[PDB]
């Protein structure tokens, strides 16, 4: 594949479930090598905007490229190498950053779809449809996912609503932004962002640009607007069949804070978000980055400053460690609405056997 | 460096500011409850002067009055305020040279220009100032600049622009140009004397601007010398390096921080909104410098002071202010405003970015989308207003109004549209 | 404006062969405009619709 | 996908070896190491793929040994040559008859070359921050009147207007519509621009329906005026103009500057 290792950084006693460091920087790069994934590794080393939704869309899109790129060899049938291709592209991703559920189950049904195709079928004839299924499969399993659960909040929520978001959840600013301009209500929008990733304030910003009331919010307080809030829908990224969630952040601790005052939270999600796999707590699995974010002295990303902070490893012993995602508990997202449109997340895996 | 004196400018321009000044003055009126020389006295306070000089001359009585209102005429600073006579309507040139002629400082002096609030540090300024005097005998001014908000896309009138230096930081040149309505000059030219002995050059357009300057003893005798120059900035300093004296040279110095001249309304305003918001830390209406308001921050983004009663069934928006005693029956649909202290109100406020000054009695019902009302500017009922407009002195508004755009509302009880007494584009009665 | 039956009569026969755009889904099936047989709608329940994600 | 374009002439700025009948531009050894030696090296650093380099009418078959013997070569270098040559065009002419050939992204590297810099990060800006051209500008000679004078951009890294001291009116000018979008304009002198081109993936439009380019400059980045007028047709992302600053003491070749080259070079 190329080089691995060599980096700075220790083990740390604290928080080791997963590896900790990569390929940013690109030096002698292999000629089969599709230049589009290296784009995409060099995005997500330092991404802003994208997060579990967006990801999976631009991966399928890559690999309808890199599928309509391809014709059957002479030597090698179509299913000779296509497969180890597929593996060592999930190792690079791997290498890069962790990925989610989503993928992994699109990578699933890449494979079925592989499986499914006999190689003595005429290979002009095969693509050509199967590009079309592809395209037919993500019109399905994608957008009218996220219309289902457009039509979902447009039953559910009454005449005109505040709102409460965290996050960069696609879908719900793309629902935000039809309440505000397509149905046309009331919107007093309050979006929380955290010190890491701006992506709260990305959101209030996309907001702006399509004219919206944003109410801006940070880790020092939430409950200065609290006590007044009355609907809440929470960032997600993935499901596992406990009830609970794995998601981004201090949503976790919003969460709490509903629980206490007033009113419970709800959270939306797509019909093939869901795993079989399950985890409970938020030291099973972590996601991680390097320690960097915080090292710049807040305001913008790229800015390279002289000043003091900057100690790794050049004082007398100093760890900057953090983590990306937390666990979210299961008590208090009662709702969950899928392309299957009504039930709650004590219902875990119900629709698991249906797909 | 102890011990200082200081020359200050208020009542600079009037008429740019069209609808008001006919009895009342133009530096007398608050920002938000609070005058704007009062932030000035305190920054010179903080600097450590222990002689201040001031120049009224419009409507200068009642100035006078309220600087003598001000704690200030007691001996427990170390200032002692004075007032320079001057007639109606004057520049910059002939006040100097009044100043000159009556001679007293001997050392360093500042002379600032404009309505100035800032929240910078300044010691440190002065010590560098102090550094550079002793680096060289030929060395005459300091100079404040700050990064622009953000892009000038509503911000129209004035494009600054300079000619920095990294090393020892100096300008010779400024300009500025209208455009957005009707297109004119595309060409600047620029001077090509010697350059190569600094070697270094930095150039940045969109800069705030204040006009300060940190004098040492030249400028007077300068002035005495030469006794063709009228404004500072224009002509002044770059003459003073046009080959005029040769070693003299000048320095500058950057900060970040908020610090904005008042100039126009629509700047008014975008200032107001800063204040509106938490953009300044030495100064905001819950420290209270003059210790006699009660005003502190509250939730939903607004600024209130003790006892303001109003009616059940209320809505109420973001970056707001309410003053003490204003008594308002039902209604309010606050979004975007100040008012002033003790305010009467019968029935309803529709406010989309709206403005109200000191003592307003305001009567039955008004859709106001972005407009200011004025002191002891009562209004009546039916009030109709569209973006921009600006109210003056004693209007006594009665029954019935509608108004539009850029429209500007008079002050005499001279020339303008929108009359004072009897009504404003329905009736007219006055001067 | 767009409308007129495509045949020579308003309404269908029994047996015969028609085209249709779905407009909505759920409830009660596909109550949609025909391309083959007038612009007015035909309906279909949730179950000579489908054979063998259905939904989706 | 990945392709690039070794341009090559004559000399005809220097002056005091170069004059010689059998001696090429390509191949002078002036101080130490080959000047088209650290080209190729630069090729190789930069993975790119089916490199060509185009010949002018002097020396068609010396380049091509070159290219061959001496030296580790291994990747398919080829020359070719192109038939419309005037020199009155150094190389614009050879960019407008090839590109056909061109497939997606190609970049514009002279013979003649002194580099000490890291030159991957040029190749990764160029990339990442959705930049349609960019140009290096390197510092003045540290090493012990009239000079040359570029507009820089330095807090995102943006380029504007490209003007020298030979032919111009004796003062300064600035355009107005040109600065309410995109405000903040900064000059510099110590700067010595080393001319090395990028080029992304549609331009090739431009160089075979109405050409204008003097020595590669004039109708490439100067054209990006999205105001007053809207007469000339922009191509699609808008135009948009970059440049960077670099440490290393190594520049470009316009005049006398070989002999400084040469002692610089050991150290």
């Given at each position: 594949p190329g080089i691995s290792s060599v980096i700075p950084t220790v083990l740390e006693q604290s928080f080791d479930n997963s590896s900790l460091i990569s390929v940013k920087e690109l030096l002698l790069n292999k000629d089969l090598i599709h230049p589009s994934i290296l784009l995409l590794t060099s995005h997500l080393a330092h991404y802003k905007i994208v997060g579990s939704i967006p990801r999976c869309i631009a991966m399928l899109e890559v690999f309808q490229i890199v599928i309509?790129?391809?014709?059957?060899?002479?030597?090698?049938?179509?299913?000779?190498?296509?497969?180890?291709?597929?593996?060592?592209?999930?190792?690079?991703?791997?290498?890069?950053?962790?990925?989610?559920?989503?993928?992994?189950?699109?990578?699933?049904?890449?494979?079925?779809?592989?499986?499914?195709?006999?190689?003595?079928?005429?290979?002009?004839?095969?693509?050509?449809?199967?590009?079309?299924?592809?395209?037919?499969?993500?019109?399905?399993?994608?957008?009218?996912?996220?219309?289902?659960?457009?039509?979902?909040?447009?039953?559910?929520?009454?005449?005109?609503?505040?709102?409460?978001?965290?996050?960069?959840?696609?879908?719900?600013?793309?629902?935000?932004?039809?309440?505000?301009?397509?149905?046309?209500?009331?919107?007093?929008?309050?979006?929380?962002?955290?010190?890491?990733?701006?992506?709260?304030?990305?959101?209030?910003?996309?907001?702006?640009?399509?004219?919206?009331?944003?109410?801006?919010?940070?880790?020092?307080?939430?409950?200065?607007?609290?006590?007044?809030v009355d609907y809440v829908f929470l960032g997600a990224h993935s499901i596992l069949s406990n009830g609970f969630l794995y998601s981004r952040a201090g949503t976790a601790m919003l969460a709490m804070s509903a629980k206490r005052r007033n009113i419970p939270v709800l959270v939306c999600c797509e019909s093939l978000k869901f795993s079989q796999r399950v985890q409970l707590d938020s030291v099973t699995f972590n996601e991680l980055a390097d320690p960097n974010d915080l090292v710049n002295i807040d305001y913008e990303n790229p800015v390279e400053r002289r000043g003091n902070k900057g100690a790794l490893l050049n004082q007398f012993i100093k760890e900057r460690k953090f983590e990306k995602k937390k666990l979210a508990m299961e008590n208090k997202p009662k709702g969950n609405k899928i392309g299957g449109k009504k039930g709650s997340e004590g219902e875990s895996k119900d629709a698991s056997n249906e797909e | 460096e102890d011990r200082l004196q200081a020359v200050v400018l208020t009542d600079s321009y009037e008429t740019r500011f069209m609808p008001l000044t006919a009895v009342k003055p133009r530096c007398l009126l608050p920002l938000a409850n609070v005058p704007l020389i009062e932030y000035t006295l305190e920054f010179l306070a903080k600097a450590g002067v222990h002689e201040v000089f001031l120049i009224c001359s419009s409507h200068a009585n009642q100035i006078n009055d309220y600087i003598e209102n001000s704690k200030w005429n007691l001996p427990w600073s170390p200032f002692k305020i004075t007032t320079i006579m001057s007639p109606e309507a004057r520049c910059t040139g002939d006040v100097m040279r009044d100043l000159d002629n009556r001679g007293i400082i001997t050392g360093d002096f500042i002379l600032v220009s404009g309505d100035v609030l800032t929240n910078i540090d300044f010691s440190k300024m002065l010590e560098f100032h102090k550094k550079m005097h002793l680096q060289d005998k030929d060395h005459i001014s300091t100079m404040c600049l700050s990064k622009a908000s953000t892009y000038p896309k509503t911000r129209t009138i004035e494009p600054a622009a300079f000619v920095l230096d990294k090393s020892t930081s100096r300008c010779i040149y400024y300009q500025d140009l209208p455009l957005p309505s009707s297109r004119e000059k595309t060409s600047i030219q620029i001077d090509p004397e010697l350059l190569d002995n600094v070697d270094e050059f930095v150039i940045r357009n969109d800069l705030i601007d204040c006009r300060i300057d940190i004098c040492t003893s030249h400028v007077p005798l300068i002035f005495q010398e030469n006794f063709d120059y009228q404004s500072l900035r224009t002509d002044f300093v770059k003459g003073v390096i046009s080959s005029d004296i040769l070693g003299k040279h000048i320095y500058a110095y950057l900060t970040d921080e908020y610090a904005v001249r008042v100039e126009s309304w629509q700047t008014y305003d975008t200032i107001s909104q800063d204040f509106l918001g938490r953009w300044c830390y030495p100064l905001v209406l819950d420290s209270n410098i003059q210790d006699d308001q009660t005003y502190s921050y509250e939730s939903r983004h607004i600024y209130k002071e003790k006892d303001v009663v109003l009616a059940q069934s209320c809505k109420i928006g973001k970056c707001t202010a309410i003053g003490s005693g204003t008594k308002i029956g039902e209604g309010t649909k606050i979004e975007n405003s100040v008012i002033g202290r003790n305010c009467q109100i019968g029935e309803n406020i529709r406010i989309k970015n709206s403005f109200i000054w000191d003592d307003c009695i305001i009567g039955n019902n008004s859709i106001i989308d972005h407009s200011l009302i004025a002191s002891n500017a009562t209004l009546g009922s039916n009030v109709r207003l569209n973006d921009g407009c600006i109210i003056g002195f004693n209007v006594k508004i009665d029954d019935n109004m509608d108004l539009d755009r850029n429209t500007k509302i008079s002050a005499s009880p001279q020339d303008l549209d929108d009359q004072t007494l009897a009504v404003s584009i329905v009736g007219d009665k006055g001067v | 404006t767009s409308h007129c039956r495509f045949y020579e009569n308003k309404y269908p026969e029994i047996d015969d062969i028609v085209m249709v755009n779905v407009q909505q889904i759920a409830e009660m099936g596909a109550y949609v405009k025909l391309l083959e047989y007038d612009n007015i709608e035909g309906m279909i329940l949730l179950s000579e619709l489908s054979r063998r994600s259905i939904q989706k | 996908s990945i392709q690039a374009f070794v341009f090559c002439g004559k000399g005809s700025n220097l002056a005091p070896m170069q004059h010689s009948t059998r001696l090429p531009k390509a191949l002078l050894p002036i101080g130490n190491r080959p000047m088209i030696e650290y080209v190729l090296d630069w090729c190789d650093q930069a993975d790119f793929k089916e490199i060509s380099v185009v010949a002018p009418v002097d020396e068609i078959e010396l380049i091509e040994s070159g290219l061959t013997s001496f030296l580790n070569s291994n990747h398919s270098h080829h020359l070719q040559d192109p038939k419309k040559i005037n020199f009155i065009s150094t190389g614009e002419s050879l960019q407008k008859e090839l590109l056909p050939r061109i497939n997606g992204d190609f970049?514009?590297?002279?013979?003649?070359?002194?580099?000490?810099?890291?030159?991957?990060?040029?190749?990764?800006?160029?990339?990442?921050?959705?930049?349609?051209?960019?140009?290096?500008?390197?510092?003045?000679?540290?090493?012990?009147?009239?000079?040359?004078?570029?507009?820089?951009?330095?807090?995102?890294?943006?380029?504007?207007?490209?003007?020298?001291?030979?032919?111009?009116?004796?003062?300064?000018?600035?355009?107005?519509?040109?600065?309410?979008?995109?405000?903040?304009?900064?000059?510099?002198?110590?700067?010595?621009?080393?001319?090395?081109?990028?080029?992304?993936?549609?331009?090739?439009?431009?160089?075979?329906?109405?050409?204008?380019?003097?020595?590669?400059?004039?109708?490439?980045?100067?054209?990006?005026?999205?105001?007053?007028?809207?007469?000339?047709?922009?191509?699609?992302?808008?135009?948009?103009?970059?440049?960077?600053?670099?440490?290393?003491?190594?520049?470009?070749?316009?005049?006398?500057?070989?002999?400084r080259f040469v002692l610089k070079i050991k150290s």
């Open positions: 309509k790129d391809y014709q059957t060899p002479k030597g090698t049938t179509l299913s000779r190498n296509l497969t180890s291709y597929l593996s060592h592209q999930i190792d690079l991703l791997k290498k890069a950053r962790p990925l989610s559920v989503t993928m992994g189950n699109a990578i699933r049904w890449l494979k079925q779809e592989i499986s499914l195709i006999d190689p003595s079928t005429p290979d002009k004839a095969a693509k050509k449809d199967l590009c079309e299924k592809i395209g037919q499969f993500a019109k399905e399993k994608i957008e009218l996912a996220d219309q289902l659960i457009i039509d979902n909040a447009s039953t559910q929520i009454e005449e005109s609503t505040t709102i409460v978001t965290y996050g960069s959840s696609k879908v719900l600013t793309e629902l935000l932004l039809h309440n505000a301009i397509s149905l046309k209500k009331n919107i007093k929008v309050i979006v929380v962002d955290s010190r890491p990733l701006f992506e709260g304030r990305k959101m209030a910003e996309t907001l702006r640009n399509a004219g919206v009331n944003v109410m801006y919010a940070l880790i020092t307080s939430l409950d200065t607007i609290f006590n007044d | - | - | 970049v514009i590297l002279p013979c003649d070359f002194v580099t000490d810099i890291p030159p991957q990060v040029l190749v990764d800006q160029f990339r990442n921050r959705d930049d349609n051209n960019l140009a290096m500008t390197i510092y003045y000679k540290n090493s012990l009147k009239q000079q040359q004078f570029f507009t820089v951009y330095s807090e995102i890294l943006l380029d504007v207007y490209s003007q020298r001291d030979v032919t111009k009116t004796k003062y300064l000018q600035i355009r107005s519509h040109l600065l309410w979008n995109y405000p903040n304009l900064t000059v510099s002198t110590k700067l010595l621009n080393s001319f090395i081109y990028f080029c992304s993936f549609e331009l090739c439009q431009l160089l075979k329906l109405g050409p204008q380019s003097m020595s590669r400059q004039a109708s490439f980045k100067d054209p990006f005026t999205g105001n007053q007028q809207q007469q000339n047709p922009p191509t699609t992302i808008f135009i948009l103009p970059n440049e960077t600053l670099f440490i290393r003491a190594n520049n470009l070749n316009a005049y006398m500057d070989a002999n």
